[PDB]
Ligand binder design. Sequence first.
Ligand SMILES: [Ca+2]
Ligand SMILES: [Ca+2]
Ligand SMILES: [Ca+2]
Ligand SMILES: [Ca+2]
Ligand SMILES: [Ca+2]
Ligand SMILES: [Ca+2]
Ligand SMILES: [Ca+2]
Ligand SMILES: [Ca+2]
Ligand SMILES: [Ca+2]
Ligand SMILES: [Ca+2]
Ligand SMILES: [Ca+2]
Ligand SMILES: [Ca+2]
Ligand SMILES: [Ca+2]
Ligand SMILES: [Ca+2]
Ligand SMILES: [Ca+2]
Ligand SMILES: [Ca+2]
Ligand SMILES: [Ca+2]
Ligand SMILES: [Ca+2]
Ligand SMILES: [Ca+2]
Ligand SMILES: [Ca+2]
Ligand SMILES: [Ca+2]
Ligand SMILES: [Ca+2]
Ligand SMILES: [Ca+2]
Ligand SMILES: [Ca+2]
Ligand SMILES: [Ca+2]
Ligand SMILES: [Ca+2]
Ligand SMILES: [Ca+2]
Lengths: 217, 217, 217, 217, 217, 217, 217, 217, 217
Amino acid sequence: AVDIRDVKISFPGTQNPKFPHLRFMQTLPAVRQLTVCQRIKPFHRNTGYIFSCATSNQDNQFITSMYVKSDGTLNLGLQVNASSNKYISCPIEIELGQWYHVCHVWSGVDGRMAVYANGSPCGTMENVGKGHQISAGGTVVIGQEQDKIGGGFEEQESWSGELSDLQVWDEALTTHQVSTVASCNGIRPRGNVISWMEDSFVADDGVIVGISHMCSL
Amino acid sequence: AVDIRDVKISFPGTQNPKFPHLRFMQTLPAVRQLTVCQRIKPFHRNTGYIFSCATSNQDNQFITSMYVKSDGTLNLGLQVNASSNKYISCPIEIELGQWYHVCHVWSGVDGRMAVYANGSPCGTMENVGKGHQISAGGTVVIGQEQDKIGGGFEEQESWSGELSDLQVWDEALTTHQVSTVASCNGIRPRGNVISWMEDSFVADDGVIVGISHMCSL
Amino acid sequence: AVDIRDVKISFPGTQNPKFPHLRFMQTLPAVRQLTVCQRIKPFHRNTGYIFSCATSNQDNQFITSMYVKSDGTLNLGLQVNASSNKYISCPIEIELGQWYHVCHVWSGVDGRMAVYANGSPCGTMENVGKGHQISAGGTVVIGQEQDKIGGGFEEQESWSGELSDLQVWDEALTTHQVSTVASCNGIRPRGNVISWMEDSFVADDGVIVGISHMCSL
Amino acid sequence: AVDIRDVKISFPGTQNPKFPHLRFMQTLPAVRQLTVCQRIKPFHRNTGYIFSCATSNQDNQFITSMYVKSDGTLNLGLQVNASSNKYISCPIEIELGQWYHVCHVWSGVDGRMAVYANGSPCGTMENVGKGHQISAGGTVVIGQEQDKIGGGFEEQESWSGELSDLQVWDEALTTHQVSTVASCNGIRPRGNVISWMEDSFVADDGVIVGISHMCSL
Amino acid sequence: AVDIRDVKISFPGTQNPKFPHLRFMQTLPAVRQLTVCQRIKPFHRNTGYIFSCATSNQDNQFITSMYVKSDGTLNLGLQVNASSNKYISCPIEIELGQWYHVCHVWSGVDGRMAVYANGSPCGTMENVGKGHQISAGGTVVIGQEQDKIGGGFEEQESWSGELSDLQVWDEALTTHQVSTVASCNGIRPRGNVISWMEDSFVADDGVIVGISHMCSL
Amino acid sequence: AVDIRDVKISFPGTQNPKFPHLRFMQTLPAVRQLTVCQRIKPFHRNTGYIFSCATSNQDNQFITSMYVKSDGTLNLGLQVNASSNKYISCPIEIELGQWYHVCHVWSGVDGRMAVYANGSPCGTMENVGKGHQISAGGTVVIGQEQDKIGGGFEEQESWSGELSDLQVWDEALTTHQVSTVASCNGIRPRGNVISWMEDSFVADDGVIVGISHMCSL
Amino acid sequence: AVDIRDVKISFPGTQNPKFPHLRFMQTLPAVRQLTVCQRIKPFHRNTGYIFSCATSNQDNQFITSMYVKSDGTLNLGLQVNASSNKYISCPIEIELGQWYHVCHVWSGVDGRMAVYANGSPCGTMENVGKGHQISAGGTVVIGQEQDKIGGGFEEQESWSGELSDLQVWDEALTTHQVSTVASCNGIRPRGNVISWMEDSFVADDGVIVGISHMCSL
Amino acid sequence: AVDIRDVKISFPGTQNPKFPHLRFMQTLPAVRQLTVCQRIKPFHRNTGYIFSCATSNQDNQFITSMYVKSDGTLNLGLQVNASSNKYISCPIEIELGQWYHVCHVWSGVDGRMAVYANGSPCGTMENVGKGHQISAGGTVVIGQEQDKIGGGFEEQESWSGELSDLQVWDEALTTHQVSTVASCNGIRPRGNVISWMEDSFVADDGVIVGISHMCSL
Amino acid sequence: AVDIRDVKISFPGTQNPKFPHLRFMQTLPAVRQLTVCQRIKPFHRNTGYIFSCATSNQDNQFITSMYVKSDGTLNLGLQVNASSNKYISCPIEIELGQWYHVCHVWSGVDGRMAVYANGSPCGTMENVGKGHQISAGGTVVIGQEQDKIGGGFEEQESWSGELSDLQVWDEALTTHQVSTVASCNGIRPRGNVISWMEDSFVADDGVIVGISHMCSL
Ligand SMILES: [Ca+2]
Ligand SMILES: [Ca+2]
Ligand SMILES: [Ca+2]
Ligand SMILES: [Ca+2]
Ligand SMILES: [Ca+2]
Ligand SMILES: [Ca+2]
Ligand SMILES: [Ca+2]
Ligand SMILES: [Ca+2]
Ligand SMILES: [Ca+2]
Ligand SMILES: [Ca+2]
Ligand SMILES: [Ca+2]
Ligand SMILES: [Ca+2]
Ligand SMILES: [Ca+2]
Ligand SMILES: [Ca+2]
Ligand SMILES: [Ca+2]
Ligand SMILES: [Ca+2]
Ligand SMILES: [Ca+2]
Ligand SMILES: [Ca+2]
Ligand SMILES: [Ca+2]
Ligand SMILES: [Ca+2]
Ligand SMILES: [Ca+2]
Ligand SMILES: [Ca+2]
Ligand SMILES: [Ca+2]
Ligand SMILES: [Ca+2]
Ligand SMILES: [Ca+2]
Ligand SMILES: [Ca+2]
Ligand SMILES: [Ca+2]
């Protein structure tokens, strides 16, 4: 039938005190590199945090985000160890309500940041979490930005849209590897740290469970 | 990989004001018969409502429930058009925390009620919604008993446990058909009104999305 | 996918001036024998006319009907050239809201009538339209009894329930042939005069187009 | 045999008080995007509404329509949240009585409207239901324009012709996806919200059930 | 599709001056033996001539006929060189309007007559055309008894019913051979003198061309 | 063996009171479009009516005809609702006694007429039965022109020759579809309203039943 | 083994009162067209009649013949309804004692005559039996010219040589069809009126039965 | 080659300050049930803790252990929420230095404990962690008993021997499931919480990485 | 599943008294040539010793190392019989945290040293251990540089990063052989002296056992 990876979650919209989000049951192990990929259907052009990882000592261990410029250009952001959000624009025009595959590749070892839109590299950036190692026990939240383990959400920092096929590796994937990940008919690799629908997560505040039609109709 | 039908939802436990539940996005069409089957892992012996269907004029259109006696005997209940809960005991000893397949078959045409535990018939009952037709637009909630469309939940009426493979037909399946439905390796039929993971639903109050290991390890 | 023969029509219920029914676009050719088979899910125990054939000179050319006794016994009736309804009971207990296959075999040549329930013979009767030939141009209506071409319906003569797989031959099928017709996984023969979903018909007064789950779930 | 998707409905013609139409049994879930495709054989050049969706608070939630210019040019229209009918002409000459595949793609997220004729894009339009979300519970009627849930039809707004293969998604399909939908021998995708012959509907006022010969003879 | 051998002809009924019949275009060669087999659906119990062969010098060269007794017993008759009709009864009860396979085997060499009903021998008779040889040029008529080449029909001698699979050999087939001929799924042998639908014939006076459902539904 | 579609009928010649023809047992349903195709072997150059459809109110509902000019050019004619015979010449030289495939495509919806000779389009014509709908119950006669249901034939309007593979659709086939119909080795499509040898017809006045050798020797 | 179609007959030579010939047991049905093909090995250059057809009223219904010019050119002749022998020469040099395939195609409908040598057309001729129809009951003789049914032979009109594969159709085959007939390894079509070795014939006056080595050695 | 599941770890022996052990990188999610299976080669008969799970608030969340009686009987122990070690003896004689498959199945829901030796059930016990839920974030250590997260080891509580194929589920496997797990050539199921060699772990104090020869030589 | 060769070890980082390393259980046999290949993910640019071999009489029998220049150039070093570290730079830019395949080929017979990066030769060097033979009994340590059998580690000489697929031969592989070794999808050759995961080794001081994603995702 439908592949379990085609399951999607809808993040309707946020307005205090309702904060639709997902919280992964099991925290992350300590890591020195991290690659987060997923298919997203953005609802707004304004900045929103998609993947948020926090520990008791640091609520901003690792946070991915995006926003669309006026011309429609996609902009992927990343923040490590509470640094400022680093952005890299992608040569692709975003149409709210449409599907796109996005990856954020980070390496604390050399401090390099690289983002991808639909399997292609948009560019890279230096000095992003250089020498930093995310402490063991990070809690992951999707759709909201944590200011506290599993909470302290701000509505202007939430992300609304549809999401599916979230795959996370504790390695910094290569340009060729990422392309095989974004591919709809490839082998469809699975993250070793988090594999969509293979790692239980908590659903709260009205997120909608449905089916993504990006890859298959 | 894993079949999308093996996805399960955990209903942690209920305590005002937190009521873990699922609400199906699309309401049901009018029906004269209804068959609801699913795999459940009960957490408590006390009565709990699993499948709740309500319309503006009647919050108790159709409600399934269960409870376990002291000797461990399973008891499946059904309520139609706000009748009293009708119960039929099953010749099977329930162990909280273990998986079981259960079906509730109702026919407003002749007013017959029949329940099944693991593909086998437990017994039938007469005069249950005889002549009744559920009005179009019923809202379905899983894990809580509605006293209002999508709400008005009571904690002593909630149902805690794990659930998966929810299949619903607007027909009254036969004894042979039900057996093919409960089978783990059969053809695994899909409900025509609601097919698990094929009909979007809203998740709220901390339900946990995971994977059922009843059929496959 | 689903076989087009599994399409079903629901006849909700009749109450002046609403008469749910089907009227076949093309009239029947003259015949001397006729076999009408179909799958039915009866809603009431009282007499109802299923297949009605009328010509300008005779509104009661050929009419099939059924009713269920108090003990649940099925009774199939037939009327030819405005004779009285001839009935033959079947050794099967009917449960309103459940599916059954039924055939009416008539031969004006020898005047014999034979009915079948689920591919098996219930019995036969003599002197039913003996020597009669249905005149060319008969109009066929399903669910209502014509007192006029395509009309003049009476509520107490209507038939409510679900129907599918209507097959009609201008020959008097044999006992062995009938059994192959009723079979769900056989060759599934098609009528040469009327073949379900292959001969267009008019739908009126709220009949519901759906899918029969008798043969396949 | 014939694929169940080749079943067609004929909308004979409308004249008070007879309004041939179809009403889907189950209402639609709330949506933010919607794609409606189907094969049509138009009988008149004048404007007619094909797909009509209404809720208690808004009878004009979503309505598709078409008309043919004097030179024969096809014009597909769309109306969202009671806006004015937006039209986009297609570079194709229509011959009444012939088959054509048509899709209407709408996205309330960015407010974009796009129409397709025979799998090809005719053009797009902005500001059509921008920011609008169709409320849960929409009733769908085919062939007539609702001014009230399931009724309030106007003859000059009806649509006569033959229709089949109605597929509806709660997503805004892409240009490439649409082409795979229109194709007669492709995979023939099925809508996730409404799939022709898989979602029961009520037939009234003389619609004719037949077989479409567009794809296969 | 349907095998051309399943084509059937209906002989409605005879009443001066209308005599439904078939006349084979090509006359028969001289013969000393002849076997005529066919599937028939008799309409009346009274005597009727099925196969009639006549030459200018003898209108009664070879004529087959049948009639049913009161008890329903079949009786096959044969007449050679204007002898009296010889009859042989068959241990089978005939039901007018039903199909049966019948063969008439004649040998002028030894003067033996043998008839078969459904591939089985009913009995034989001596001194029937012993030493007789049908002269070349016999005209064959089906359904009527010739008193003149291709004419001079008498209504009380006509045969009404349905007929198909007419096979004629200029040899006297064996008991085993006949059984293979009557078989519906055997090899279905074809006559060497006349092969149904392979030897053109003239149709007159309202015979009806249709399809036999004896062998296949 | 030989395909049942290769059966042919010979229309010897007409001379009062003998009018060789065929009359289809079952009348046609009401239609708004009609396509009639068949293989013909014309015997004369003068006008002859091939397909004649009549109702009690109109004996000239639909009539096809042909004639050959002096230069041998084929001319196909059509008449709807007693209009004048519309003719379209075909760029092909006819040799009496030879086989040709011919189709007449009519659409009352737009009033267009199109004819084909051997799968190719000869041309089209406007305003032919524009807005007309053939009333239900049309009687079809082949070889003669009805001035009364099933009768009132005129010899100078009869058509002599050989005919086979008569296929009739209640739709107006496309140019590509027609080509697949005329093809001898294609899929050989079958008409949905009338399928040669699949819809019984009455044979009268000496028509000859034989086998067409157009497609196969 | 050897195909029965390779059987050949030798016509030694004629001299009163010995006339080697073949007479077909069964006479021909009435025809309006006729195609006669066969493989011949001519022994003399002088005119000889190969295929002779006669009825009581006309001994020269249809007669084929040939002769070879001094330069060796083949000349095929035909005579219908006692017309004069029409000849068409073939661009091929004949060597007495060698094999050749020959066809005579005649159409009384348009009066056209066409001959073929080795599957290729030699030419055609008009006004040959135009409007003529061979009466039913023609007797066929091979090797001699009848002046009376089955007799009245003249030596100077006989034809000596070897012959095989005689195929006769009551249709006027096309140029392409003829070529498939002459081919030794094609499908080897069989005549529908007379098929070599499938239609019994009388052998008299010393004809020799052997095997043709034209097609296979 | 060798299956990655056949990798084994040797726990040499413990003596302050050297404590050979394994610490899983990623902590466990909250659980209500837990099944831990693995292949072990015990070195001593005295009590040793194999699987130790601790959280900041409770160092004895879940601990498995074993010891061998003097007669050689195996004894499997379990401790939940700092209860006393519960033991169940197995009807199998242990030989130090040999391989055995062992599973510990615990369910906090009903408080039942069950142990298995080589895929077979040894017995069960009640009231073991009844109503207890292990808090999220448990740290897992193999070979040593934690008195503090990842430390506070005691020599007399260590476990020496060889271990491999550690599989852990957050469900309470059934008797039949367990047997499929212990099987060497079965499907070899993998734990969903911890899968040997698929979930990184820290190795310290001289553990030896080698290859298990229990299943394959 | 995953190939056992994809197992990797992480060397976290070194700081007295913690020295993460691996010590192979079985010492090496005497050798005159040695080839050491493995996949490495370096964490620092500064010099680190990867493979260290020592005997009681010589702690620096054979030691491999690497460092990265400021421009990112890779530099592979080798030391034999306590010579000075010989370095050869590779035309490849190293990115800390990324995977690379590296081989060190040494031959005491001719004293030649050759290094490879990703299966390609970087260059060679002479006079490196020329005439030297490593004495039997060498102890191998990975990640630390021995100054004593299995110990005497210095932090500034340690190597941090991830490593897998360690293969060692007592022969000096050729350029072509090396390339087949580095290949991810080749035959993946195994060392004859040490084969990753096939020769047991001791793990100490927090090395992490995980899975390499260089070759497969
Ligand atoms: Ca924060
Ligand atoms: Ca924040
Ligand atoms: Ca903030
Ligand atoms: Ca309630
Ligand atoms: Ca309540
Ligand atoms: Ca209550
Ligand atoms: Ca009536
Ligand atoms: Ca009535
Ligand atoms: Ca009445
Ligand atoms: Ca409206
Ligand atoms: Ca309106
Ligand atoms: Ca209006
Ligand atoms: Ca007679
Ligand atoms: Ca007579
Ligand atoms: Ca008589
Ligand atoms: Ca007329
Ligand atoms: Ca006329
Ligand atoms: Ca006239
Ligand atoms: Ca003559
Ligand atoms: Ca002569
Ligand atoms: Ca002469
Ligand atoms: Ca402890
Ligand atoms: Ca302790
Ligand atoms: Ca202790
Ligand atoms: Ca050293
Ligand atoms: Ca050192
Ligand atoms: Ca040093």
